[PDB]
């Protein structure tokens, strides 16, 4: 029948926004995308392909759910993460902001 198989455009059900994390802290991110057979999304930081490293850890579930964890967190981590989900149906994207408050460096012991 249908040349291909059932498939719907990539739609982000739950998208993040503007979070705040003090430098040297844990930064977790959650995002759900609907689509079939499986909408592939890529992370982008400041118009650049962000790659997972000892600090940046990308998660991939078997339901399309994705997450980007960072630790420690630097000042450069703050910016606009633009992700683009492309599925056999179509393609989608979204924007987000991340605030990072520097550490309280001082002669005091915290």
């Amino acid at each position: 029948g249908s040349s291909g198989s059932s498939g719907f455009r990539p739609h982000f059900l739950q998208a993040p926004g503007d979070l705040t994390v003090q430098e040297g802290k844990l930064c977790r991110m959650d995002c759900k995308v609907s689509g079939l057979p499986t909408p592939d999304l890529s992370w982008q930081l400041d118009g650049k392909p962000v790659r997972p490293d000892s600090a940046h850890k990308m998660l991939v579930r078997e339901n399309g759910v994705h997450s980007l964890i960072i630790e420690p967190v630097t000042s450069r981590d703050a910016g606009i993460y633009t992700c683009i989900a492309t599925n056999r149906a179509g393609q989608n994207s979204f924007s987000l902001e991340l605030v990072v408050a520097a550490k309280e460096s001082g002669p005091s012991s915290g």
Side-chain angles (χ1 to χ4, degrees):
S2 74
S3 55
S5 284
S6 54
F8 329 74
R9 270 150 207 170
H11 154 80
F12 296 102
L13 289 168
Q14 206 185 85
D18 44 282
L19 291 152
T20 329
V21 184
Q22 203 196 267
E23 190 199 333
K25 288 286 152 173
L26 188 279
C27 162
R28 176 159 164 198
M29 280 205 231
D30 67 328
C31 67
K32 207 201 190 73
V33 51
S34 187
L36 277 159
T38 280
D40 202 300
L41 57 150
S42 194
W43 291 86
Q44 310 204 351
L45 179 54
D46 306 326
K48 290 207 293 88
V50 59
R51 68 161 76 83
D53 207 53
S54 180
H56 299 77
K57 190 210 279 291
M58 276 150 226
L59 297 164
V60 185
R61 301 280 66 81
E62 207 170 328
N63 298 2
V65 167
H66 272 46
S67 302
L68 174 76
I69 301 163
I70 299 164
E71 208 280 354
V73 162
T74 62
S75 56
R76 89 203 155 167
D77 295 359
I80 299 295
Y81 290 94
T82 319
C83 209
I84 304 150
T86 326
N87 210 3
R88 169 67 168 276
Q91 184 169 232
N92 287 49
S93 198
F94 75 82
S95 70
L96 87 81
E97 172 171 38
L98 156 60
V99 182
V100 58
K103 207 206 182 280
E104 54 165 65
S105 198
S108 196
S109 299

